[PDB]
């Protein structure tokens, strides 16, 4: 019964699950809400507008480990934040693609600012703090994108165990390798690593 | 003058640069080759067929560090292969997306088999060898995807230097962190890392 912003977005998230980022259009959203296209256009001007809103909501509803806890170590922060970002992305169909295809908004910007601050307080230079957060974000995006898209002897036998896993243990193992890489770099300081 | 397979693909790569993965269609490719749609349909049945071919060609033309050299260390292999994969992906518009959206083919499968073999000869268990290659692939895909899609105080001042770089130094730094993470894990062996 409503074209209130929260209900447009809830309905569009529902639709995104039904049809994916490609098949989602303002025309189908209007059909879904019981409304004429010019009525919807008043509210949501185009698909780019829609997807910007959806990206924000995806991270607003499900990315609850965005900020580091009091006393938390940097390692645990990156681990927990990566884990939270991944699950937020996997909640909706093409969620990674919705995230990729929009520019950062006010929240993300404010949130990454608090994260750099946190990192810098923990030994990281600005560039390395930023690189760390970005590299973790890129690794996580790649993994989810591959999962949401988703025979030689050795590949056969190694695939035994990717089988029994949509991608989480592989994601978790690689995440530790990265964090340990960052610990070693960080600890070496201004000498040869 | 030709609908030979190599010329369809060359022309489609040209088109992909002009219009991106979204805007690329068989109808526009036919327009481009000077040919009627039913004529093209004989050769390329649909866009999925097209994109499968394009993915293969992207990696066939530009991914020349696919295989490890004689005497090469595993570290150098992953570094060089990642670097080569990234540049291959960045050659064409939406190249990462073309890569993501198709299933692996015979070459990729044969190539990843040789890579697992190489890794296993170097201390890696099958699962860790596979995880290493996958994690590097995901990190690299994420980075390129972000680049081909592509204000708080601290973010301002850290962005000074992502400015002067499309993404390579950030990619290179994170790549070392991952490789060092893998060295440490690998070397620790069957004890507490």
From Swiss-Prot, chains A, B:
Positions of Mg(2+) binding: 99
Coiled-coil stretches noted in the UniProt entry, renumbered to this chain: none
Protein residues bound to tetracycline: 63, 81
Up-regulation conditions: By the [Mg-tetracycline]+ complex.
Keywords noted in UniProt: Antibiotic resistance, DNA-binding, Magnesium, Metal-binding, Plasmid, Repressor, Transcription, Transcription regulation
Swiss-Prot/TrEMBL GO biological process terms: negative regulation of DNA-templated transcription; response to antibiotic
Disulphide bonds in the chain: none
One annotated GO molecular function: DNA-binding transcription factor activity
Quaternary structure and partners: Homodimer.
Role summary: TetR is the repressor of the tetracycline resistance element; its N-terminal region forms a helix-turn-helix structure and binds DNA. Binding of tetracycline to TetR reduces the repressor affinity for the tetracycline resistance gene (tetA) promoter operator sites.
The protein's name: Tetracycline repressor protein class D
Encoding gene (name): tetR
């Amino acid at each position: 019964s409503r074209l209130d912003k929260s209900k447009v977005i809830n309905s569009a998230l529902e639709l995104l699950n039904e049809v994916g980022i490609e098949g989602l259009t303002t025309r189908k959203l209007a059909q879904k809400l019981g409304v004429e296209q010019p009525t919807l256009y008043w509210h949501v001007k185009n698909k780019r507008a829609l997807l910007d809103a959806l990206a924000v909501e995806i991270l607003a509803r499900h990315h609850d480990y965005s900020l580091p806890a009091a006393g938390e170590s940097w390692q645990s922060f990156l681990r927990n934040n990566a884990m939270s970002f991944r699950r937020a992305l996997l909640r909706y169909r093409d969620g990674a693609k919705v995230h990729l295809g929009t520019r950062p908004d006010e929240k993300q910007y404010d949130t990454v600012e608090t994260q750099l601050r946190f990192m810098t307080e923990n030994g990281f230079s600005l560039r390395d703090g930023l690189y760390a957060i970005s590299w973790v974000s890129h690794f996580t995006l790649g993994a989810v994108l591959e999962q949401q898209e988703h025979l030689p002897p050795l590949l056969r036998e190694a695939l035994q165990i990717m089988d029994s896993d949509d991608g989480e243990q592989a994601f978790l193992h690689g995440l530790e390798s990265i964090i340990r890489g960052i610990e070693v770099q960080l600890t070496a300081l201004l000498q040869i690593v």
